Each structure stands twice: as C-alpha cells, then as structure tokens.
Scaffold this active site. Structure first.
Site, PDB file in Angstrom:
ATOM      1  CG  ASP A  92       2.547  11.654  13.449  1.00 26.75           C
ATOM      2  OD1 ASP A  92       1.457  11.996  13.974  1.00 26.75           O
ATOM      3  OD2 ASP A  92       2.646  11.327  12.249  1.00 26.75           O
TER       4      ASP A  92
ATOM      5  N   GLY B  59       0.788  -1.215   0.000  1.00 23.10           N
ATOM      6  CA  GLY B  59       0.000   0.000   0.000  1.00 23.10           C
ATOM      7  C   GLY B  59       0.824   1.271   0.000  1.00 23.10           C
ATOM      8  CD  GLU B  60       1.164   4.535  -2.637  1.00 28.06           C
ATOM      9  OE1 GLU B  60       1.435   3.614  -3.434  1.00 28.06           O
ATOM     10  OE2 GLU B  60       1.922   5.510  -2.435  1.00 28.06           O
ATOM     11  N   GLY B  61       2.150   4.547   2.163  1.00 24.94           N
ATOM     12  CA  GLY B  61       2.378   5.105   3.484  1.00 24.94           C
ATOM     13  C   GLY B  61       2.677   6.590   3.381  1.00 24.94           C
ATOM     14  CB  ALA B  62       3.976   8.957   5.910  1.00 25.61           C
ATOM     15  CE1 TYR B  63       9.436   9.794   5.510  1.00 27.95           C
ATOM     16  CE2 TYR B  63       7.958   8.199   6.526  1.00 27.95           C
ATOM     17  CZ  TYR B  63       8.858   9.245   6.638  1.00 27.95           C
ATOM     18  OH  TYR B  63       9.176   9.739   7.884  1.00 27.95           O
ATOM     19  N   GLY B  64       5.290   7.087   0.540  1.00 34.74           N
ATOM     20  CA  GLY B  64       5.024   6.587  -0.799  1.00 34.74           C
ATOM     21  C   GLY B  64       4.711   5.103  -0.818  1.00 34.74           C
ATOM     22  CG  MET B  65       4.931   1.059  -3.705  1.00 34.58           C
ATOM     23  SD  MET B  65       5.130   0.581  -5.440  1.00 34.58           S
ATOM     24  CE  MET B  65       3.578   1.140  -6.128  1.00 34.58           C
TER      25      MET B  65
END
Ligand SMILES: Nc1nc2[nH]cnc2c(=S)[nH]1
Length: 341
Positions: A140, A23-29
């Site tokens: 965070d 999936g996609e996270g905070a930084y990308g793929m």
C-alpha cells in the site's frame, strides 16, 4: 478517568500528556502528545480492532512487522500502550516519532525541487530494499504512507496490508483482485495478479515519483475499473511479447479487444523533469512486471548516483520466511507484551 479527545477515550497517560487531535487515519483517531520520559512530542495512534477478525489481522501485521524491522527509512514503534490483561484490553495505542508531515500533505501545496525529488526517491527505495530483503511486500505504498520530519527524513509507514512474498502463487483471473490503493495499483492487479510479488511495490513507487514531478497523480482512475484505462492511456498498447506473457484468456483478450493507443512520451508529460529521473520512471512504470526494474537496480540508477552506496543500504537480519479474532487478540496481546512495566 482517562484523557478524552473529541468526546472519545484516548487513554495514554500518565507518561503522555498535552494531547492534540491531529486527525483520523486508517486505524482511527491520531493525536500528538508530550512524552514525559523522552521529553519530546510523539504521535499516538488509537486502534480498536478486536470485534472484527479482519481488523485484528491488519493490526497484528502492523505491529509484528514494525517491531521486527529496524531501519532509518521505516517508522519505528517506540511504545505500545494497552491494558494489563487480555480481558481488559479494548484499545491499543501505538506510539511513534512525531513527523512534521507526509508526502500526500506536502504535494498538496509544495513544489519539490529536483534535489528533493531525488532525495525522497532515494529514501523510499532504501527503505523498500530493506522491506523486500525481509521477503515482505508493503502493498500500500502511496504519498500518505510516506512520513517526513522537519529535516525531510522520510519514513515508510503502515504495514497493515503487507504480505510475505509468494511469487509462485501470484497468478489469478481477470478483474478479481483488490490490492493497494487505486491510483497506485499495478496494471497486472486488474489482469492476472494477486499482488504477491515485489514488482507490485515498484509500480507504486513509480506512481509516487510521477506525482512528485508534477504534484498530480499520474493515473487518476475514478473507480476500480477506470484505473487500467488511465495506465494504458499513457503507456500505450502492450507489445505482442508482453501480451504473450499473459496466459489468462479473459485478461489477454480484453487487452486485444482495445483499439491501438500510442505511448505518451514522459518528457512531454513532464517537460521540466530531469532526463535521468524520467528514464528511471519509465523503468518503474513498465507494463510487464517481469521486465519492471527491481529495487536494487533502481537504487543503482544514474538518477540516484549522488546517494547510492550499497554498504549503507542495509538488509533485514531476519526475513519472514513463511484465525478467529479471539486467537488474534491473544497474539496481539503477546506481541505487545514487551512494552509493559
Ligand atoms: N504527524 C504525524 N506524525 C506521525 N508519526 C507517525 N505517524 C504519524 C502521523 S499519521 N502523523
């Protein structure tokens, strides 16, 4: 030719094969992959930060902090993949232990036993003790940054938003600050704090504990300005003593302008919760950040007595005691050098 995933370059080979899109996270793929050296599947995060200074900042924090830290309840970086030269480097891939799930995903469908809540909370606080001992604020903490493997080992992740603690420069004005993720954001962030003190993190852990108890976020603000409404709706009006600790007039007068609100008892909100868990919850979700429990006190709380062992709750050897994108790229290149063959 590099490996492709969803039509996007995911260039991690040849050590890492059999890619699967997670999936996609905070930084990308994010993908999973088979590590052909350690014969185990791993998680790999693709980062592409170099065109933007703020992206470079976050990426440098993430890498530098995680490479220095070594702790059972903090995700490690196993490997970093990037081009051999700074001019050829466009993407950076961070390789980490593959974890079955995270607390966000878990809480979507699973009810936690009191024993699991206790164990998760202990691990969060054990990790946080190490982080804070390094003079670092995570800033965070939230369920999706708490990774879990198949045996419920918990590891804190994403230090991209972290800062070195700076309590003597924490005071600011009213409704200016943007720290943490909304639901997990301490009341003082909206009032008079830049989020440079360790108490910011304890508030988030309190929010996470509450969420573990009921599988619903305790303070579900619908937007930035709504968040304080939810916090005060449960904690009730702050005391004169706590207001007296807020010297900023805009912040204090905002609070004074509100009609009285009663405290909602925790045992009414959580009628099936362990009484010791609710006592600790109250101490973490304390309005006044100076009165708010600290991480070492929280570990020693009776709720966690089955796990508490200070000699097995290690601290950091090397605390952190104290730029254009081009300089940051150079630092990222240097920070990642140790992983090159
Ligand atoms: N499944 C999974 N495992 C991980 N290990 C480190 N980060 C992750 C993520 S985001 N997902």
């Amino acid at each position: 030719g590099p490996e492709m995933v969803r039509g996007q370059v995911f260039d991690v080979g040849p050590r890492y094969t059999n890619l699967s899109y997670i999936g996609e996270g905070a930084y990308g793929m994010v993908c999973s992959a088979y590590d052909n050296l350690n014969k185990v599947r791993v998680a790999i995060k693709k980062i592409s930060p170099f065109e933007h200074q703020t992206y470079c900042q976050r990426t440098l924090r993430e890498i530098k902090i995680l490479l220095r830290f070594r702790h059972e309840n903090i995700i490690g970086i196993n490997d970093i993949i990037r081009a051999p030269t700074i001019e050829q480097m466009k993407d950076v891939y961070i390789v980490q232990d593959l974890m079955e799930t995270d607390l966000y995903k878990l809480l979507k469908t699973q009810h936690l036993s009191n024993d699991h809540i206790c164990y998760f909370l202990y691990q969060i606080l054990r990790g946080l003790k190490y982080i804070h001992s390094a003079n670092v604020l995570h800033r965070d903490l939230k369920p999706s940054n708490l990774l879990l493997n198949t045996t419920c080992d918990l590891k804190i992740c994403d230090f991209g938003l972290a800062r070195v603690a700076d309590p003597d420069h924490d005071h600011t004005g009213f409704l200016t600050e943007y720290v943490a993720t909304r639901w997990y954001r301490a009341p003082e962030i909206m009032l008079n704090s830049k989020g440079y003190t360790k108490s910011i993190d304890i508030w988030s852990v309190g929010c996470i504990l509450a969420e573990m108890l009921s599988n619903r976020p305790i303070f579900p603000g619908k937007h930035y300005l709504d968040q304080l409404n939810h916090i005060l709706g449960i904690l009730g009006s702050p005391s004169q003593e706590d207001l007296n600790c807020i010297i900023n007039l805009k912040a204090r007068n905002y609070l004074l302008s509100l009609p009285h609100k009663n405290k909602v008892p925790w045992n009414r909100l959580f009628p099936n919760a362990d009484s010791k868990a609710l006592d600790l919850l109250d101490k973490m979700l304390t309005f006044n950040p100076h009165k708010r429990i600290e991480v070492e006190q929280a570990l020693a709380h009776p709720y966690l007595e089955q796990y508490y062992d200070p000699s097995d709750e290690p601290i950091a050897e090397a605390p952190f005691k104290f730029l254009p994108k081009e300089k940051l790229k150079e630092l990222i290149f240097e920070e990642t050098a140790r992983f090159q063959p």
